[PDB]
């Protein structure tokens, strides 16, 4: 038997790190009713999706979907979304384990591909990237890529538990370094372009995310569309709603949660 919940230690470390390094400012982000813990039968075993959601003064949303339907179906989809008054990149950590094998996509998806953006956010990561890409070779077959995109297909669970885990850890820590140092953008022209790039990226993810197929099979189309557009890649809904106010906390009374929520 292969490791059942290979990304459990990944999420636990991320939660510990988020809790410690963002502790002062970290508050809950609202998880819509019906999308905290979703279970279905697959095959043949129970298959659940656990959601986690947080926010800070600089981070519009940190959210994870942790999926587990046994060794053959495991996903950890963790993404950091900055507020629109910062020029920060996203941090995306998309870890997927299937019968075919592992699919690992780790990146700080940049708002811009200019030399000055790369100078600011790519070049400080080059050492980290070159270190980890040695162990995590290109995974095969762009405007949202950074120079330090790690796209790899480990063939053995041990590679995930070691090399992928260390890369996972380094990219989170390096990203949170950027977040600490980042300062509000006040120039209106810069803010207009930041918002354009954020909306373009989130529209792309909401429309083309590969989990749509998996979630539709497990829970049906309606739940899948609401999860994707209403939580995982929810900026456009929150903006059209009028809930999103740049740099402002989204009201939510739920307490911080970092552990599975028994259904």
Author numbering: 2 to 44, 49 to 146, 152 to 273
Quote what the paper states about this structure.
However, during the reaction, a second aspartate residue gets involved and likely serves as a proton donor for the proton coupled electron transfer to the A-ring of the tetrapyrrole molecule. Here we solved the crystal structure of the PebB homolog PEBB (nuclear encoded proteins in eukaryotes are denoted with capital letters by convention) from the eukaryotic cryptophyte alga Guillardia theta.
Incidentally, this construct contains the full FDBR domain and reflects the mature GtPEBB (mGtPEBB). Crystals of mGtPEBB diffracted slightly better, showing the same space group (P62) and almost identical unit cell parameters. The structure of mGtPEBB was refined at 1.9 Å resolution to an R factor of 21.1% and a free R factor of 23.2%. When comparing the substrate-free and the substrate-bound GtPEBB structures, only minor conformational changes are observed upon DHBV binding. Substrate binding mostly leads to a stronger coordination of the mobile residues between helix H3 and β-strand S7, forming the “lid” of the active site. These residues could not be modeled reliably in the substrate-free structure but showed defined density in the substrate-bound structure.
